[PDB]
Amino acid sequence: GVYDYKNFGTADSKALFSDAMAITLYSYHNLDNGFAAGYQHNGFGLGLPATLVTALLGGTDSQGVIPGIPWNPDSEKLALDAVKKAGWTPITASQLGYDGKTDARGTFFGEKAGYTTAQVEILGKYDAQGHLTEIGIAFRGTSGPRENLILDSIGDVINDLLAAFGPKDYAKNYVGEAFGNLLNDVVAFAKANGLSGKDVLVSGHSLGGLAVNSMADLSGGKWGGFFADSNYIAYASPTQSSTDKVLNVGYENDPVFRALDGSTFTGASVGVHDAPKESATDNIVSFNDHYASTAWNLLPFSILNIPTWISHLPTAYGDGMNRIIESKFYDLTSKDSTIIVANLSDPARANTWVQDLNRNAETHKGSTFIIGSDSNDLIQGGSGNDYLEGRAGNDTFRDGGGYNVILGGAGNNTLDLQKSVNTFDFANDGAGNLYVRDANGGISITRDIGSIVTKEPGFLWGDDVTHSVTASGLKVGSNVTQYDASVKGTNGADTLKAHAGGDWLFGLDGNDHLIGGVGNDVFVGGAGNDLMESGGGADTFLFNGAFGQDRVVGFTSNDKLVFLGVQGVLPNDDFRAHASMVGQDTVLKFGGDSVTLVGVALNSLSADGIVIA
């Protein structure tokens, strides 16, 4: 998964992640709530003035920067309710025996001159019998309490500037100078509750992402080494620690994120700074109204260009990245997977195609994941290999080519092929998958998409035609575009045999024996350990999901293997990364799943006969 961490598996990494996000969101106390709401209703162009009104005064359903407006919700109490729902309760200065500053909310404040506008939250996770099981440490980014916002922010900005322009280790020592004492009292508190360093999660966003990396840098030497094996997940940090301890998560179009290298100011710092970084997720795009805008991007991408900071705001971090966590494609992803997160306003969502523009960023490689919203989206895949997820709402998909998985989600979803129905082949396995094969051999596996739009010039001489996806073909009323010749199996073990003319063969679940003929067949073994025999001709073998340990017989020169939505594909992996000889057979391994090409020598294979997506 993109957020895999240390040697925690997929699931434990995600749980860690969601906690870090939750405690990071709490540390801001819903300050950008008003912005988020104003933006969602108004956008970031014509209606940007109105978005900004809401950023300051919120509305009936949001609180902006100004406190005590009666018709606003109590966003701060919602912020506390939210963190508790996640399992976290602030630990009082009283429980730690801390003699430093806190405010009425229990927020801890930096200890030394020049660090007094620093903020951190210390939080506990308690079990059923009420024992402490985990400590959360969330460092607040730039900004402070609504009561002292401007003055507090000015302090933070001096600190930010010192990170870039001051003592060489300024950023590294930030947490030592700000919370050295608080953290000794935290070490004592954990000990007293039977907790070690492994039971501590450290998070924060922006300046607080800097703090995360600071503590990681200091953790080997300070606090008696107690925090050395703690969990560090930082969001939108300008810096990266010199350790291997920190997961640095951000949107590649957030200009704050990785602004420094790892704390060095460079020429890149005030422009695009998108070089690959070991600690960072390199390729996550917040597809927001700014990113999508042609007008906005006539201006230079720069941390100095304030409008670009929309991509920095923490609510879109929490909302967009949560949907990456929930995604059906999640386990396909890794740290540097290209992922496009639908983050448009309501009015831009109505007329803007979410797509990989690759704006202001190094060239994206490998497959692309586009993650929709729970509202009606317009999603456009590229000409390469795509994973498009609609989620809820009535979504419409386009895609430019290659090898794709398109999941409609809930709602009434539509795939717009933009071309004549006659340039495609359709098949359906009877188990919720519609296969679309285009004139170039690219295959899309589609689910929950009930309408296909095609352009028919020589029926509508100037021309969209809408086909329903049914068990008997694609239908325009009573008129049928037939699926390609198929043999459908069951979720039991089946023997399936192709006709001489070629068939799509659908094992579905169970260990199936698929017997090709002299024709060009398409083999979909399905889940389970399948035996597939070519029988001659130019055959396609397609592998998707947790496909099993398959055996392929009679595979030749003119045959194609297709891997799509399978485990362990690093950006731009080719077949060689997954292939070995075992005996006389070539095996291709994808996570725990495998294909054995019986009697085929590794050296006879060509990347053009082997598609990895």
- Which listed residue (13, 18, 75, 206) is catalytic? 206
Angle, in degrees to the nearest 10, between helices 33-42 and 48-57: 150
> What is the chain's length?
613
Stretch that binds a copy of itself, among 50-58, 88-96, 181-189, 324-332 (CB under 8 A): 50-58
| Binding partner of residue 471 among Ca ion, a copy of itself, none, CB cut-off 5 to 8 Å per kind | none
Helix-strand-coil split of the chain, %, nearest 5: 25, 25, 50
| Binding partner of residue 49 among a copy of itself, Ca ion, none, CB cut-off 5 to 8 Å per kind | a copy of itself
Contact 262, 316 (CB under 8 A): no
- Cβ proximity to Ca ion, 331 vs 539, nearer residue: 539
Residue of 75, 263, 404, 446 that binds Ca ion (CB under 5 A) = 404
**Hey, is 283 helix, strand or coil?**
coil
| Binding partner of residue 409 among a copy of itself, Ca ion, none, CB cut-off 5 to 8 Å per kind | Ca ion
Contact 244, 274 (CB under 8 A): no
161 binds a copy of itself (CB under 8 A): yes
Residue of 547, 555, 575, 590 that binds Ca ion (CB under 5 A) = 547
Binding mask 275-314 for a copy of itself (x = CB under 8 A): --------------------xx-xxx---x-x--------
Residue type at 399 in one-letter notation? D
Contact 33, 60 (CB under 8 A): no
Give least dist CB 261 to a copy of itself, A. 20
57 binds a copy of itself (CB under 8 A): yes
53 binds a copy of itself (CB under 8 A): yes
162 binds a copy of itself (CB under 8 A): no
The token pair at 219 is 């953790």
Q: d(Cα 479, Cα 314) in Å, to the nearest integer?
A: 51
128 binds a copy of itself (CB under 8 A): no
**Hey, is 255 helix, strand or coil?**
coil
Stretch that binds a copy of itself, among 145-153, 197-205, 507-515, 588-596 (CB under 8 A): 145-153
| Binding partner of residue 390 among a copy of itself, Ca ion, none, CB cut-off 5 to 8 Å per kind | Ca ion
- Cβ proximity to Ca ion, 238 vs 390, nearer residue: 390
**E strands in 525-573:** 531-533, 540-543, 549-553, 560-563
- What contacts 24+ positions apart, CB below 8 Å, involve 349-354? 349/373, 349/375, 349/376, 349/377, 349/378, 350/376, 351/378, 352/289, 352/292, 352/378, 353/378, 353/379, 353/380, 353/398, 354/287, 354/292, 354/378, 354/379, 354/380
Binding mask 126-145 for Ca ion (x = CB under 5 A): ------------------x-
- Cβ proximity to Ca ion, 366 vs 381, nearer residue: 381
Q: How many residues touch a copy of itself (CB under 8 A)?
A: 26
The token pair at 303 is 């941390």
Q: Is 206 a catalytic residue?
A: yes
Residue of 262, 535, 565, 609 that binds Ca ion (CB under 5 A) = 535
- Cβ proximity to Ca ion, 454 vs 544, nearer residue: 544
Count Cβ atoms below 10 Å from residue 592 Cβ, excluding itself: 11
Q: d(Cα 59, Cα 77) in Å, to the nearest integer?
A: 16
Interaction residues for a copy of itself, span 368-387 (CB under 8 A): none
Residue type at 574 in one-letter notation? D
Give least dist CB 278 to Ca ion, A. 13
65 binds a copy of itself (CB under 8 A): yes
Give least dist CB 426 to a copy of itself, A. 44
Confirm whether residue 548 is marked as ligand binding: no
Which run of H or of E encompasses 423? none
Q: d(Cα 245, Cα 219) in Å, to the nearest integer?
A: 10
- Cβ proximity to a copy of itself, 71 vs 459, nearer residue: 71
| Binding partner of residue 510 among Ca ion, a copy of itself, none, CB cut-off 5 to 8 Å per kind | Ca ion
Give least dist CB 98 to a copy of itself, A. 27
Q: Which residues are CB-neighbours of 146 under 8 A, at least 6 positions away? A: 29, 31, 65, 66, 67, 76
| Binding partner of residue 239 among Ca ion, a copy of itself, none, CB cut-off 5 to 8 Å per kind | none
Give least dist CB 47 to a copy of itself, A. 8
Contact 112, 178 (CB under 8 A): yes
DSSP structure string for 55-104: HHH--SS---SS---TTS--HHHHHHHHHHHTT-EEPPHHHHT--S-B-T
- Cβ proximity to a copy of itself, 53 vs 602, nearer residue: 53
- Give me the residues that bind Ca ion (CB under 5 A), please: 117, 119, 144, 152, 156, 252, 274, 282-283, 361, 372-373, 377, 381, 386, 390-391, 393, 395, 399, 402, 404, 408-409, 411, 413, 489, 494, 507-508, 510, 512, 516, 521, 525-526, 528, 530, 534-535, 537, 539, 547-548, 550
Q: Name the residues annotated as catalytic.
A: 206
